[PDB]
Amino acid sequence: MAHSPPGHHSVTGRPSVNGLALAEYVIYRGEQAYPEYLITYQIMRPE
Amino acid sequence: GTILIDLSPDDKEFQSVEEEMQSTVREHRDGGHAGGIFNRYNILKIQKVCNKKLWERYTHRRKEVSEENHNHANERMLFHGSPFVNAIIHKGFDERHAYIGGMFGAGIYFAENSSKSNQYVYGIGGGTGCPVHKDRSCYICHRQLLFCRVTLGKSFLQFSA
Ligand SMILES: CN(CCO)c1ccc([C@H]2NC(=O)c3ccccc3N2)cc1
Ligand SMILES: [Zn+2]
CA dihedral B115, B58, B16, B25 (to 10 degrees): -10
Contact criterion met (CB below 8 Å) for B81 and B41: no
Contact criterion met (CB below 8 Å) for B35 and B118: yes
Q: In which domain, by residue range, is A26 found? A: 1-47
- φ/ψ of B46, rounded to 5, equals -125, 125
Report helix, strand or coil for B2: coil
Report the residue count for chain A: 47
For the residues of A1-43, what is the DSSP string, one character each? Answer: --PPPTT-SEEEEEESS-TTPPPEEEES-GGGEEEEEEEEEEE
Residue partners of B87: CB distance under 8 A and separation at least 6: B96, B97
Q: Label each residue of B22-42 as H, E or C.
A: HHCCCCCCCCCCCCCCCCCEE
B97 carries a ligand binding annotation: no
Contact criterion met (CB below 8 Å) for B88 and B146: yes
Contact A4 B156 (CB under 8 A): yes
How many domains does chain A divide into?
1
B99 conformational bin, left if phi > 0, alpha if psi -120 to 50, beta if neither: beta
- The ligand that comes nearest to the alpha carbon of residue B129 is 2
Of A8, A17, A34, the CB nearest to B155: A8
CATH number at residue B56: 3.90.228.10
Experimental technique behind these coordinates: X-ray
CATH number at residue A36: 6.20.320.10
Residue partners of B150: CB distance under 8 A and separation at least 6: A10, A25, A27, A32, A33, A34, B75, B76, B77, B78, B110
Nearest-Å Rg of the Cα atoms of chain A is: 16
Q: In which domain, by residue range, is B121 found? A: 1-161
Per-residue burial over B91-124, b if 16 or more Cβ lie within 10 Å, else e, is: bbbeeebbbeebebbebbbbbbbbbbbbbbbbbe
* Resolution of the model in angstroms: 1.6
Q: Which residues approach ligand 1 with their CB closer than 6 A? A: A 24; B 79-82, 84, 97, 99-100, 102, 109-111, 116-117, 120, 124
Q: Looking at the DSSP assignment, which residues form a beta bridge with residue A39?
A: B46, B145
How many domains does chain B divide into?
1
The alpha carbon of residue B35 is apart from the nearest alpha carbon of chain A, in Å, by 9
Q: How far apart are CA B144 and CA B61, in angstroms?
A: 26
